[PDB]
Structures are given as structure tokens and as C-alpha cells.
Amino acid sequence: KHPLMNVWTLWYLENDRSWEDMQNEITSFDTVEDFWSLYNHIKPPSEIKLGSDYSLFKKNIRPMWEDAANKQGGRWVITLNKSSKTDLDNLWLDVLLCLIGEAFDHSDQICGAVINIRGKSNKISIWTADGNNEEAALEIGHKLRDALRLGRNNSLQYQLHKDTMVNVKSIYTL
């Protein structure tokens, strides 16, 4: 097997009637082979039920801002149309490959990623540890823009977690 730099944990959120126990820790992996073994046997985002999330975070980091790893952080947000024109599945995978492949110079600043399946739109977000660290967020954000081929008219928006829990304010845009 080919080892990964970090150990990653896949989470799956599904709406049920629970409050914060709606988040399910599926499994963890630390090799490329085991990643695919997991990815090959789960539904792609496009087939996921409305209101559900996939989240991939480093080991011992919960997919919530309250976590000690996310408390001072923020996220690069990608908003997407519901239409089939959007390459939602391949875009989510490329985000995952960026993560586990450690495509970022500030690897220690990466916490994870989340894909939200909502009614009006879908959101893919990359979570980083320190919002104040401009050099970190930007380096990561630029790696994303150049890797994801978002285009001219599409923008990456960085949002502090504190601003989310209040039409969310962004502090960086790419």
C-alpha cells in the first residue's frame, strides 16, 4: 500500500429525528488504496439525499467549527448550481485528492473539507485552522483555484467560522 502523509476520517451527515448526533463517523484511512476502497463503495455526492453532508477531516478533528482544530479557523467556499451542467462529483473528488495528496504547502493548516447538499444550491468548502493567517489561507486558496478549474466568473470565498454562525461575510476572495 501507498501511505498518506495524514490519517483521514470520512463523516456522513444525514437528517434524522437527534441534534448533533446526526453526524456519523464512518471510517478512517491512511493509505491511497484504502481511500479508493472506501470511495468506490459509497454514493457520489450527486446521489446523496437532500440535507446530507460528506466530510473528510484529519484524524481527531470533528467536522464542526467548535473543534479545537477549527475554532480559530475558516473555510474556502465554492457555491454550485443544482443543474447537471455542474461537474459536482468530479469536483468533490478533486478536492479530496488535493487533501490526501497534500497539494498545499501549508499542510498543517488544512483541517478538512465538506460538501453540503441543500435545496437552493450545493456547497463545497475547504476548512483551514487559522483565519488570521493570511499567507496560509491564500496559498491554499490559490492551490484550489489552479487545481479545480473554477473559471473566470466563479470565485473562491474565504469565510471565518465566527461569521458563519450569525449572507455570510467573506474576508478573502479569489
Partner: protein
Amino acid sequence: PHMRYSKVDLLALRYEGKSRQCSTRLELQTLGFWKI
């Protein structure tokens, strides 16, 4: 050390023997994310 995999390197291993049994962790949890 620093283990960096390109998108190509990662995709190249997508259809290995171990990449194709199924995942290990399968707790008694019934959720719709599992493929069929």
C-alpha cells in the same frame, strides 16, 4: 516526512487489487450513503 501525491499518482492507484475489496469498517448503521 513529506508524502505528496499528484492527482495523477492518486488516480493511477484507483483500480489496484486492494482499492477494488470493500472497506473494512461496516458498523451496524443503516444509512443511505452506502452504494449498491
